[PDB]
Design a protein around this ligand. Structure first.
Ligand SMILES: NC(=O)OC[C@@H](O)C[C@H](NC(=O)[C@H]1NCCC[C@H]1O)C(=O)N[C@@H](Cc1c[nH]cn1)C(=O)N[C@H](C(=O)O)[C@H](O)c1c[nH]c(Cl)n1
Ligand SMILES: [K+]
Ligand SMILES: [K+]
Ligand SMILES: [K+]
Ligand SMILES: [K+]
Ligand SMILES: [Mg+2]
Ligand SMILES: [Mg+2]
Ligand SMILES: [Mg+2]
Ligand SMILES: [Mg+2]
Ligand SMILES: [Mg+2]
Ligand SMILES: [Mg+2]
Lengths: 102, 70
RNA sequence: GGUAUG
RNA sequence: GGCCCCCUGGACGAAGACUGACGCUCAGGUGCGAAAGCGUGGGGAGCAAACAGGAUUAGAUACCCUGGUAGUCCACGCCGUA
RNA sequence: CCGCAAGGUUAAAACUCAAAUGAAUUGACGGGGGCCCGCACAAGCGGUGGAGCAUGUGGUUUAAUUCGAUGCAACGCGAAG
RNA sequence: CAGGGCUACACACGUGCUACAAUGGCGCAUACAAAGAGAAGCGACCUCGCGAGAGCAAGCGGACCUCAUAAAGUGCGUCGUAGUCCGGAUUGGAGUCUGCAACUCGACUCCAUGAAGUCGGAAUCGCUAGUAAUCGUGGAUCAGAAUGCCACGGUGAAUACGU
RNA sequence: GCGGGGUGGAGCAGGGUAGCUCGUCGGGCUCAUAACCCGAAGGUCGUCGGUUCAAAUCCGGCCCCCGC
């Protein structure tokens, strides 16, 4: 039945998707700011953000460079975000902090 | 017969275009080093964080040649 | 049948 | 680029008759000049920059989907470029 | 100079590079087209991937785990012990 | 030069072997190969040992002698779908043989033990005929030490519309 | 003060009848990487019971915990 319509109105409840910005150990200020902007938006518009850093070949040997990038994001997106997850180990070659709308 | 260099260890603090690097040396001075020819030819990659030997010159203590990566 | 990247 | 009427420019052919070099080119100048655009006033079916929502994606400020405003149309003026 | 504006028109130089460029030639490549072949696919039959064990390799370990082979074309390979 | 290591073991992968049974396992009886090796070698018969083997000792540098019963098969019996009379890992005890020597680290036998495994996710390999599959057999290296490699026969399919 | 909820590490589904997402690890695919694909490990589900044939489920306590 047009019953359906009920759902259409029900479906005017809402929904959060997680959006994935991948950073790399040495991304530069310009692109950081672009991706940072993307996240601000993502978050302010009610969404989560799986922020991934993706070491490639030998870069996996200076994981501590990576962690500093994540820590910079956390510290910029501070008043907008709370940090569901942080990583410590480097499973695979990744570090997959998940931020959520404060 | 040539004049002698000053070898010194340092950490690559950032990579720059075309195999140029900032390297903070043992003494704490940051030099803009470039890759050696032998390392270029043999394809030894250098990255941020890598410990490097740097040949410096007395003619300029803001510049060096990375001759080894450890 | 169409994904990009060295 | 439907059809019809009114007003109007050029081209071409046939024979002649007529004028008698009146020609050719042209810096500057003058006019015309797709589309978008601009001003003012109309009009607005369809289409559609912007934009809104829905997707896709690593991201998707796109391509795809549903809508949709300027505009596209008319008058007059402007613009003077492909 | 022109335009209400968007802009148009006229139109340099410093500097830096040792090229930039046109057409065509031979390849290679194309999510261009056309024609073919091979257990390439399809059709089958039996396997591998799961188990235990043998064997080689990576890794890790070690005083040493000797050296070499590393996509196809290293890995029961040099080693027929 | 002796001893150790190349045999290490949280773990990941390549190539294999053996299975998960009844188209089978076990017992007994009984058919049919090819190819090859051999002198400090292959070693019969016979005697002894449950067996691996031992002793004695012929023959053969081989179409002669020896390795050396092919196995799957066939027949009859038994097991009756069970983690089993499937599987044979692992471990204990006891041996044999080669070798100055089998602790690290051999092969094989005997008694005991009897693990995982009930046909294997995504993915992926080989093969078009005497092939695949399966069944034995031999050889090179080699004192000893193949599930590898190189060869040999036995039984013996399925499927190919097509690009 | 008043509530919500406490569910594999992650967070979120779910009167009995525990997933889903992303981690986490390994595999597959590729010349290689991401993407893609498969498998496994992770809970006993706030706690305490009562109570229901059923305890994530029901009911209360408690621990709460943040929102407020
Ligand atoms: N998004 C991102 O970052 O990556 C995803 C992108 O690479 C997907 C890819 N997209 C395309 O080629 C575009 N071609 C133009 C039309 C739109 C779109 O289709 C693609 O695979 N398409 C598929 C459809 C699809 C989208 N997402 C998942 N599947 C497709 O069928 N593409 C067609 C093709 O490759 O020939 C064709 O372009 C098509 C038909 N209809 C549509 Cl829509 N697209
Ligand atoms: K004139
Ligand atoms: K409109
Ligand atoms: K001007
Ligand atoms: K010049
Ligand atoms: Mg003229
Ligand atoms: Mg116009
Ligand atoms: Mg107007
Ligand atoms: Mg429309
Ligand atoms: Mg549209
Ligand atoms: Mg022009």
């Amino acid at each position: 039945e047009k019953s359906k319509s009920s759902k259409e109105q029900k479906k005017k409840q809402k929904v959060i998707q997680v959006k994935e910005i991948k950073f790399r150990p040495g991304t530069d200020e310009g692109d950081y700011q672009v991706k940072l902007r993307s996240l601000i938006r993502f978050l302010e518009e009610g969404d989560k953000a799986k922020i991934t850093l993706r070491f490639r070949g030998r870069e996996m040997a200076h994981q501590q460079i990576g962690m500093e990038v994540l820590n910079r994001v956390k510290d910029d997106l501070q008043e907008l975000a709370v940090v569901e997850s942080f990583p410590t180990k480097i499973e695979g070659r990744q570090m997959i902090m998940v931020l959520a709308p404060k | 017969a040539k004049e002698d260099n000053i070898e010194m260890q340092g950490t690559v603090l950032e990579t720059l275009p075309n195999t140029m690097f900032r390297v903070e040396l043992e003494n704490g001075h940051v030099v803009t080093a470039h890759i050696s020819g032998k390392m270029r030819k043999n394809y030894i990659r250098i990255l941020t964080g890598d410990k490097v030997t740097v040949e410096l010159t007395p003619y300029d203590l803001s510049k060096g040649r990375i001759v080894f990566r450890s």
